[PDB]
Structure formats: C-alpha cells, structure tokens
Symmetry: C3
C-alpha cells in the first residue's frame, strides 16, 4: 500500500499503457473515417501542445544559465566529457547496427550538410523559435529550429558568464524563468496519464521490424548501463527506475524535445541530479544524440541493399539527417529519402515502413532519452570536482 501512495503517477502512467492497449484493441474494428480517429486521439493531442509549448522557454533558459553558472574554462572541459560520451555511444550503436544485419540479414545529399550548417547560425532568433531552414526548389519551413536556439543560447549564456557584474541580472532572469517553466511542468505531468492512454490507443487504430527492436533493447538496457557501471561504479537500473515517469512519456510522445521538460523533472527529483549539469547535458542530448536513431537508421539503410565498401559514407549521411530533424514534422519519413540517394536505391520501400514506424519511432526515443539521462549521470561523476570549485 505504501508503494501506491508514493509512486501514484508512476503507476498511473503504467496503467495508461495497459488501458491504452486494451481500449485500442477493444475499438480495433474501425468503421470510422481517419477524420474521426483524429477526434478520438484528442485528449492526448492536447498533452503534446502543452509539452511543445514548454520546449522553447526551457531549452533557451537551460543553456543560458547552464553555461553562465559553470566557470568559463571549466565549461569547455566539461563539454569534452559530454562529447566523449556522445561520440563513443554513437560509434557502438552504428557498429551494433551492422552486426544485426550480418548474422540475421532479413533536396540533395550535399544540401543536408549545408542546411545543417545554415541552421547552426540562425538568420533571425524570433523566426528560429518556430521555423527551421531546409532549401527547396519559402525555404524556412515550420517547426522550431532547436539546433539554432541551443547554439545561440550556448554562446549567449557564456557571454553572460564572462560579463559577471552586468551579466548577473540576465542569468537571475533565465533561472527564474527556468524555475517557472518547471513549475508549469509539474502540472502537465498530471494530464500525462489521461493523455498517454488516448495517444497510443489512437496510433494503433490505423521479421525486419523485429530486427531493430532486438538490437535496440540490448544497446539500451545492456550496453548503456554497462557504460554507467564502468564510469560511475553505481547501480544503473536504480537510476533508470528514477527516470520511469520520463521513459513511459518517451514511449508515447516519440520526441526527445517534447519529453525533455519531463526528463528534466524526473532526473532532478527522483534521481537527485544537479541542475547545472542537467541544464548542460540534457538539452544538447535531446537534440544531437544519435545512439537511438543511428541504430534504427543502420538497419533501415542496409534492408534495401538486400533487394539490390562505402559503409563509412552511409553512417555520416544518416547523422546529418537526424540532427537536421530537431522539431520537423514527419521527421523519419523525409530524412530516409536522402540516405537512399547516397546509396542509389529506390524510395518504393518507404511506403511500407511508414505503416510500422509509428511504434518503432517510440522505441528509438526511449533509448535516446535513456542515453541523455545516463549521459548526465556519467558526466556528473566525471566532473564532481568542477562543481565543488563553484560552491
């Protein structure tokens, strides 16, 4: 009984998945038009709006205070520690992806690299808050430029750190805002159980597929906790238990950015991790992490090759696509088109994967959110001395 009283929301979100699968399977014979399905998935559609609302005033305030709270020289070194994790776990994921297709075996290319660079330095910051760039033959398309806001908030936040006296007012300003936008997220958390059940129920009512989920669950729950135990020497599945209210949301939302306001709450509260490092690792992680998506795209790129050397060129192109899709609508659907041009394979295969990606996209995010959460834990232990200096 004492477990039900403490972990009330945790069990309710678990109940939401159970009831969500039940309600979906109960209302599986569909005599209703897809127009009506959209009307049904509405109590979960509202949760998405509330979460996406909070993305921007969280991402901007997180990194502005994050880089200013952290010492000017220490910021640079702590970042190397984050990139050490971000590049290592990405190499293992793309390596695991080639292993899975070996034993089992079941817009332009150049423009994606240019558009990514075009977004790193935004032309306008007001536009950046709801518009991203991707050249077409308007090139500024709908959907937040989270890459441009993260990059600007890094240097802007750092500029305030090196400003000290004059810079103190604005850091106090974004810390107040980060705390306010986190007080709003404690409320949106209570709508989540009602949301999740109406969100996953709507999405169900519409061997290669298994290949991804097989390697996905082993990289997530075996490779990553082994990286935590190797560096921190602490129990990883106790840490994973803390971020459960964040992991369940990830399995429904499918967006690391939309789940970031909850990922922030779950890590700060349940796991007890320092805000300065969560504001540093988490926003960047939920935007440039390749672990989850690289493993999903690796099997997705060698699948059409079976129907039909230079493996290094396939991985780099699959990386420039996902970082290029920060908050872009139908992200995995449009990015997989460019990777097929680099390998020279038809786009006829995509029309089949879309019908099953809806569930696969939920799983790739669950690994990405675990990668960012564990990434923070690994960073804190490897930088415990740098935080002692500030106190």
């Amino acid at each position: 009984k004492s477990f039900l009283r403490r972990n009330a929301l945790l069990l309710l979100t678990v109940l939401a998945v159970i009831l969500g699968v039940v309600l979906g399977f109960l209302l599986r014979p569909y005599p209703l038009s897809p127009r009506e399905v959209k009307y049904f998935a509405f109590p979960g559609e509202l949760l998405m709006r509330m979460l996406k609302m909070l993305i921007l005033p969280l991402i901007v305030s997180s990194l502005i205070t994050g880089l200013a709270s952290l010492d000017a020289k220490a910021s640079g070194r702590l970042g190397m520690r984050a990139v050490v994790y971000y590049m290592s776990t990405t190499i293992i994921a793309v390596v695991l992806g080639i292993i899975l297709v070996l034993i089992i075996h079941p817009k332009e290319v150049l423009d994606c690299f240019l558009d990514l660079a075009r977004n790193i330095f935004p032309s306008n910051l007001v536009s950046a808050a709801f518009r991203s760039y991707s050249t077409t033959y308007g090139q500024e398309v709908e959907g937040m430029n989270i890459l441009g806001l993260v990059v600007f908030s890094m240097v802007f936040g750092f500029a305030l750190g090196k400003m000290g006296e004059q810079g103190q007012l604005l850091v106090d300003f974004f810390n107040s805002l980060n705390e306010a936008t986190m007080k709003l997220v404690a409320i949106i958390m209570w709508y989540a159980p009602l949301g999740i059940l109406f969100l996953i129920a709507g999405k169900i009512v519409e061997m290669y597929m298994v290949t991804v989920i097989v390697g996905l669950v082993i990289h997530g729950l075996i490779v990553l906790p082994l990286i935590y135990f190797l560096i921190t020497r602490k129990n990883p599945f106790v840490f994973i238990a803390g971020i459960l209210q964040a992991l369940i949301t990830a399995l429904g939302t499918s967006s690391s950015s939309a789940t970031l306001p909850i990922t922030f709450k779950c890590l700060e509260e349940n796991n007890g991790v320092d805000k300065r490092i969560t504001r540093f690792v988490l926003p960047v992680g939920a935007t440039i992490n390749m672990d989850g998506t690289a493993l999903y795209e690796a099997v997705a790129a060698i699948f059409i090759a079976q129907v039909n050397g230079q493996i290094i060129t396939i991985s780099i192109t699959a990386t420039a696509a996902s970082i290029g899709a920060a908050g872009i609508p139908q992200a995995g659907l449009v990015t997989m088109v460019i990777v097929l041009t680099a390998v020279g394979l038809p786009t006829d295969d995509i029309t089949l994967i879309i019908a099953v990606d809806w569930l696969l996209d939920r799983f790739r995010t669950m690994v990405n959110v675990l990668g960012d959460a564990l990434g923070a834990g690994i960073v804190e232990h490897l930088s415990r001395k740098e935080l002692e200096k500030q106190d």
Copy 2:
C-alpha cells in the same frame, strides 16, 4: 468653459463622431473605386495598428502581474466572482435574445469545440503572439491567439506568485512593462480623435437590423447598470461617464482587444479602479465575454428559421464561435457559417447581413466593453476584503 478644459479629449472624440458622420455624408456620392476608399480611411487605419501593437505586451504583462500580486488562494476565489458575473450576464443576454424574436418576429460543428481546446494550450508561445489554430482541409492561421496567451500568462503569472523570492524579479519586470505599455497608450489616445473621424467616415461609404439595436441598448444601458446597483449600491451612469473615452473608441474599433489598452486607461484614471483587479477582470473579459455577441448572434440565428426545440444546442455553438474568434480577421463573417450547419439552414442569408454588420459590430462591442468595465466594478466591491489583506 471649465468642462472644455478638463474633458478636452472626451469632447474631441464626441466631435470626431459628429464630424465623422458629416464628412462621410458629405462624401457619400462615391465615383471612387474601393481601392481609393481604403486610401481615405488611412488616418484611422494607423490608429488600429498602434492599438493592436499594444494588445500583446499589455495582455501578457496584465495577467502575469495580476495573478502574482493577488494571493495564491484568494486568486482562485476572486476568479469564481468573475465567472459568477461572466455566466449570469451571458444567460440573461441569450434569454433576452429569444424574447426579442418571440414578440417582434421579423470546418465542422465539432471542430469549433476542438479548435477552441487546441488554442487554450498553445503549441508554441512565439507563434501564439500572432497565429491562432483552426483546422482546414497550414491550419495555424494569421491573427494573435489571445486565448492561448491569456491562459499561459495566468498559470505562468501564478507560478511566479508561488515562487516568491526567485519570482519577485520577473513580476517586477512585467509590472515595469505594463507601466511602460500604458505610458505609450496615453499618447495613442491623442491620435484617436483624428483616427475615429477618418475610420467611421470610410466605413459608411461602401427591420431585422433594428431588432438587435433595440435589445442591445436595453441590455447594455438597463440590465447591466441594474446589476451594478444591485451589488455595489453605487451610481452606474457616473461609472459609465468615466469610461466614455473607452466607449467612443469601442464604437469605431469594434474589437474589445484593440480597445482594451484604452479601456484600461479610462478605468484606472477617470473611475479610479485598482490596477490588480483591472489586470485580472479586463483582459479575460475582453476575450471570453459573451454578453454583447450572444445577444447579436441569438437574433442572427433565429432570423433564417422564419424563412424555413433544440434551442440549447444553438446557444452553446454560438459561444464556441466568438471565444474561437479572439483576433481573427472577418470574425462575425466566418463564425456565423458554423452555427447554420448545426441548425441546418443555407448560407445564402449571410451575403445580405455583411452589408449592415459593419455598424452592428460596433454596437455589440460597446455593450461588451461596458460589460467588462462594470464587471470590474462589481468584482472590486465583492472582493474589497481580499485586497485589504495584501496591504
């Protein structure tokens, strides 16, 4: 002579209506193309831009400071007092509308209720400042989402109230901004006489109509002041005299939001009403008040029924349309289309009402602005003890 010296602007705006009708009737034979009429109505078209400019930094700052200045528990109870007024005066207005058609007698329906809920929780706050949602088969259409900004500013303002120490800096920030955006409104007030005369003169040069204005003037100047005298026990037409510089602007602007920066000045200055309650009742009132529009739409919905039980379904649909039209262009023209689908009557009748609505829209706002102004007065008297606690 002493009246001319004190009430200089008040008489100038009165003179603007007189000269506006004269200039319009003097330049009534129109050999000029509607392109040229737009060029003539320009010195009043600028006033609209200046007022609409000020809407957003007023609405956001008003409710942020409003909910933070007011005590956390008292905010909830004071709101019940506002909703008591907002739901009672709306019931009387829709009741008076059915009475007027009894003696005299002269996008989907479901989507309007969904889009309203879709706007209450905005997906992005930067977009919300100039874009509203209304699904079409881009669904985000031009025009400020005043509903989404009011709702966000309520919870955000409240979050700062419950933040105290850290939250003090941001409340001091939006109070400075509210005072600054009010110092700009004292200036825009002097352009108003020159504006009003060129605005109403341009709009003229282009039994059922009388039915609305008959009940409109009796609900406004008879029903509402009786609600003031019943609760406050104070003289209502002395209060109405204070908000005259606001009532005249309403008769030209036709938008409660565009007139709100002046409605704020008229109530704070001439009537001497506490800023904490004006920042609480007025922004919400100038967005969710149904009094004026419900009385206009009630006669507009039973008029086509004469050409041709379930009266409850007509009223709720007419409510979801006007709240859905916060700052939407050609508001009364597009909303009246949905109400005809619920009753099952043709849209052929709208092509006739548009030619006379231009003057009828000015009258419905005049009652709505009086409803929000008197609403504040009724709220202050019913919550004088809650404000004493803060001092």
Copy 3:
C-alpha cells in the same frame, strides 16, 4: 612588424579582398551550374546569417537604452542635431546626382508612401521582428521591419526614461543585452576574413556604371570629411581609419543593418566614441540614411530619360523606396520599379542594371556606413555639453 601585431584583423580583411578577387578570377571560367556557385559562396553565406541574427537584439536594445540614458528634454534637441545632418547630406547627394548627369549625360506610387506609414506603426511587435508590410493584389512579407522596431524602441525607451525608479530595471536589462550581443559580435568578427573572401569571389562569378562610382567616391571621401572638418575641426581620415574593419565588411555585406553590429564595434573601440550617442545615431542612420542610395538612384532615374521640370517629384519617391526597404530581399531591384511609374518610363532597362548592380550596391553602402559613422562624430562634438550634464 608592430603594425601586423596590432592591426591583425584589419590586414586579414584587406587580404580577404585581395585573395577574394584572385580566387574569383582564378575560378572565372564557369562550367558549373548556378546551384554549385551558391554551394561555393557558402563560407560567406554563414557570416551573413550570424550578422543578421545580431541585428534585432542590437537595434532594439540600442535605442531602448539610448533614449533612456539621454535626458528627456535633451533627447529631443540631440535628435534635431541628427536630422540636421540627415537632411543636409541628403540634399547635397541628390544635388550632386543631377550635376553628374548634366555634364556627362551617358504596387503604386501612392502605395509606397502609405506602406511606409503602415510600417512606422507596427500592428504586432513579434511579427515586426521578421515581417514587413507592402500591400499586393498576404501583404505582410518576409524580412524584418527595422523601421517599426526602431520607432517602437524609441518611444518605449523614452517611456522608461520618464519612468525613472520602476523603469531602471528594464534599462539595466537592455544594457546587459546590448553588452552581451556586442560580446557575440567580437567573435563573428574573426569569421569575417574567411567570409568576405568566399562572399565577393562568388558574386563576381555570375560608362553609365562608372558615372555612379565617380560621384559616389567624391561625395564619400571629399564632401562628407569636409562636413566633419567644418563642425568638429578634427582630422577625418584618422576617424575613417578607425572604422576600416567596418568599411571593408560594408563593401561585401551591402547592408547597413547587417554591418551595424561591426560598425558599432569599430566606432566604440578604434575611434573611441561614447556608447550613448552610437546607440542613438547609428541604428537610425543605418535605416533612414539616404546619402549613399539617393546618389545611386538619382543617376538610375535620369538614365532612362535620355532614351525618351518635375525633378522634385522624382527625389521624394526615391526616398520613400529606400526607407521602405529596411531588410527586404532584392531591395534595389523592386524599389526601382515604382520610381519608373512616377516618371512614366519602361521597366525594360532594369534587366540590364541587375547584371552590374551587385558591385554598385556594395559601393552605395560603403558611403552610407561612412555617413552614419561621420554622422555620430559630428553629433558628439555638437552635443558634448548634453553628455556632461548626465555625468
């Protein structure tokens, strides 16, 4: 050797022009599609994004602190001193333009004056940060409304000045932001040499022309320094030497707004000019200065007259076009269409000038930036007593 150590960036930007002309002429035979030329001009295309990013949080913060730091009554008088320079140098430029065509001799008109007034008072401030108005038969077109933001920031900044106590927090806020957005500009300055060489090299690879450059260099380097020596009595080409890192950028960027963040740094650092006057003269100057463009448009308007009284009507129309083009894409290309309607000459001549304007546009900005820089110097000397009062 001591000159290379101090003026490192100054010589690098000089080297960028030299190497930029060399690389362009080396890669002059073009077997590559214009699609590939765009890909080549990319390391300079990024510099433009970084600069344009900084325009808005510089322009808004500059004038907000500028009008608040300066005394309420002194602001009005110091402005007359700026307009004295802005109207005199414009009269001389349009006079010099008629002289050049005398010896050598080698949307509606009304709507441009209406749209300019429509932009001075913006309808929305969020939209103003990335959208300008210009009626077409959406009228709000892409590109920052720098006119509307300058005008709003003037009155808003002044409102804070007249607010004192409450207003102190927000002025401290925009001064922190101006200092932060200037700390970002010191970094973007180091990318400029790499940018300029890839920017001008790409633009090359694609008697009347000489007529503009002849009068342009004599008004810039002869007329303007004579205005400095007549008022300040100080050496002008020592001042011009200080703003060299700004003049070189102007010869590549072609936009006074995009070069303003560097024009600000060059004047504050190298020349040692007071921030209060740079925040006052420079943003306004880089938006309403007609010197450079009026001289270019004067020769451009009387050139087609040769192919084919009321000279006063041609000058005023050429003024309403350039102020109307603050941050509008293909500015000189669309504005020259309206001036031809007022004189009654065909638009067949524009198709030829576009092929050479790319270099002529770079020269007109170089004079405009020199006009704003020298304008500040002339203003400081004519208002040295007004700044002593504040200290």
